[PDB]
Amino acid sequence: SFVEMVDNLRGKSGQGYYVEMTVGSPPQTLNILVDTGSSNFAVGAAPHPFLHRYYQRQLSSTYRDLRKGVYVPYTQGKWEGELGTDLVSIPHGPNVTVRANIAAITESDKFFINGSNWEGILGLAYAEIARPDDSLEPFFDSLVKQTHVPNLFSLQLCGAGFVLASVGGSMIIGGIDHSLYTGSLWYTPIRREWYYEVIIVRVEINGQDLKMDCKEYNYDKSIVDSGTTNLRLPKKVFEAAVKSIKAASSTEKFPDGFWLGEQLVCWQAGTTPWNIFPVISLYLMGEVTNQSFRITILPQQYLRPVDCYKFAISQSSTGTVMGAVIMEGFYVVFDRARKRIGFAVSACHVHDEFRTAAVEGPFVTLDCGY
């Protein structure tokens, strides 16, 4: 029953959303980051200064060694571990237990976050991008193959809403909970099964078209990633977006350290002038070729609380990333079975009495992909 699954996520602002899981026998309780942007189930399995608990394979009667190592260097840092399998459950998820691959992390750099309260990562994306290669079946694939759970999951990330702010949300596995959203669910195709890749066909700031060749919005790809905090945009698009946002909020000036996403700005208790910042609309490709639908986000989503805030839109060199701050406005359905992603206005999204996040379509757009 989906009711048991409601509010099963927690986190700290800017530090990811995590769900409680158990690994091994007897069950070892760990908090695990819900990450649609990667494809390994990777868990701290050795002492680390930021870890207050970790996976102890020797304490597990059901652990099985794969006798194989894994090394994952990446932009921000790296992680390194040992492959095996064990029994895994999600206490506030489906009532099943699965045998899944587990990368036991033995060494890492800049991977874990101080005080985040999670000890591992659940990569929900596809095998194509699994480390060390695509033969290592990802968790969700094992779950679907081993149980009768429908090949779909959905995420309602709620954020903080009014010490880093604590956030909450829901991960519904195997279905769609109609109490978590209002209005219509609109679907955009999954272009390819590796990341959750999608196509953006245009973007507006306060109703004003950025007027770019749509290839620019997806250069070199566009993905939906619960494991990225910000909305990240390709250089050309980022610059155009900030120019427009700057002009919209011209009354009142901020330092470009703020626009560069590393400097906070503060008002005091309920004085924040939301009405000065514009809304942002991303139009996603519809299931029908010449159609699209728009998701519209507010400043309440793209100014992340830290009353202090940081600009949560930043530049990318690896394509558009629709991260947590974009997802927070919405109920997002990862319909793997039908190769599509749905968006509907979330029952929990933060907004004032003049504006609201929105999902609206269709818009007919009469080649946007990389």
Ligand SMILES: CN1C(=O)[C@@](c2ccncc2)(c2cccc(-c3cccnc3)c2)N=C1N
């Ligand atoms: C972008 N991204 C990463 O860098 C990370 C990753 C996962 C697996 N191997 C390499 C990188 C990742 C790793 C650690 C922490 C985060 C993170 C940090 C802050 C907020 N929320 C997620 C993300 N997962 C995503 N999606």
